[PDB]
Amino acid sequence: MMSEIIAVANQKGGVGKTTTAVNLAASLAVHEKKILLIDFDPQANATSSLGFRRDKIDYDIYHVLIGRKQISQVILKTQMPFLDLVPSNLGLAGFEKTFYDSQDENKRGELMLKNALESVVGLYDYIIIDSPPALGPLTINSLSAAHSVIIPIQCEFFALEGTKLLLNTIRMLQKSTNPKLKIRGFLPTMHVPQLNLTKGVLAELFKYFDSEFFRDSATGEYIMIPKSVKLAESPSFGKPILLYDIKSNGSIAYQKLAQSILQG
């Protein structure tokens, strides 16, 4: 209902999905908009990014999906008063099995996350979903639950084929399980402007998808997350970058992203 649910998705591995989900969630939360981050990857990197140890997590999103727990029972408060987390753990890897079992019986396996979110949509301004690297049941559940999708894009070769495919999947879902699903935007990540490869991949993407790239709401510039040493360091301190170095380039870029989201 009230919450805009935003999936951060891209089947390619290591393109900044988690970094984006975490830092966007934080960058929205610092405005005292109430944010819920869903770690929807069994590797649980978002969870770890916010300083939570895998060995310290009790019940997680998986338990909610299978009905062992209500989502209110697993929600954790973070260092930021307006950022809450539904953590992940290894047991989310069991989801696939569950999914297929669901499909065999009268159930809509693609909607399990959507259903799980039902009881908190009226309680948050934004729900941000960190998706895993594939187009399987988990990512399908993420996209099926979302109002909109942010696609982080690393400008290297595999990005070209990959983006097209993700778009295909999205359109599939638009014609089936989630008609209202929109692209919130493409977000270049780990961006190194002067590389020939970067320029080539970007130019190719602009040709088809110019209108999909995030724009700075004050200046009209394209929003891109620069490759940043500090950004890589941040999960090692268990904090979003804005909590300790708010003037760093990565922090600044993610805050521009949040402003863009807050406007609509």
Ligand X SMILES: Nc1ncnc2c1ncn2[C@@H]1O[C@H](COP(=O)(O)OP(=O)(O)OP(=O)(O)O)[C@@H](O)[C@H]1O
Question: DSSP labels for 160-194?
Answer: HHHHHHHHHHHHHHHHTT-TT-EEEEEEEESB-TT
Selected binder of a copy of itself within 196, 207, 219, 220 (CB under 8 A): 196
250 counts as binding ligand X under rule CB under 6 A = yes
Q: In terms of CB distance, is 9 or 120 closer to ligand X?
A: 9
**Residue span 169-198 as binding mask against ligand X, x where in contact by CB under 6 A, dash where not:** --------------------xx--------
| CB-facing half-sphere around the CA of 61: CA atoms within 13 A | 33
Least spacing, CB of residue 101 vs a copy of itself, in Å: 8
- Please check whether residue 82 is in contact with residue 35, taking contact to mean a CB–CB distance below 8 angstroms: yes
Cα gap 88→93, rounded to integer Å: 10
Given Mg ion, a copy of itself, ligand X, none, residue 250, with its beta carbon under 5 to 8 Å by kind, binds ligand X
Q: In terms of CB distance, is 137 or 235 closer to ligand X?
A: 235
- Please check whether residue 58 is in contact with residue 85, taking contact to mean a CB–CB distance below 8 angstroms: no
Alpha helices by DSSP H, listed for the chain, are: 17-29, 45-49, 61-65, 95-104, 112-117, 137-145, 159-175, 196-209, 229-233, 249-263
Annotated ligand binding at 182? The verdict is no
The residue range among 28-36, 69-77, 178-186, 230-238 that interacts with ligand X, by the rule CB under 6 A, is 230-238
Selected binder of Mg ion within 18, 139, 178, 255 (CB under 5 A): 18
Amino acid at 182: K
Least spacing, CB of residue 138 vs Mg ion, in Å: 11
Least spacing, CB of residue 184 vs ligand X, in Å: 16
Where in 28-57 is the site for ligand X (CB under 6 A)? Answer: 41, 45
**Residue span 214-243 as binding mask against a copy of itself, x where in contact by CB under 8 A, dash where not:** ---------------x--xx-xx-------
Selected binder of ligand X within 3, 7, 9, 12 (CB under 6 A): 12
- Please check whether residue 205 is in contact with residue 186, taking contact to mean a CB–CB distance below 8 angstroms: yes
Q: 254: which 2 tokens?
A: 């993610």
The residue range among 111-119, 150-158, 177-185, 211-219 that interacts with a copy of itself, by the rule CB under 8 A, is 150-158
List all residues 6 or more positions away from 187 whose beta carbon is below 8 Å from its beta carbon: 16, 20, 150, 151, 152, 153, 213, 214, 223, 224, 225, 257
Least spacing, CB of residue 156 vs a copy of itself, in Å: 5
Residues that bind ligand X (CB under 6 A): 12-19, 41, 45, 132-133, 156-158, 189-190, 225, 227-228, 231-232, 235, 250
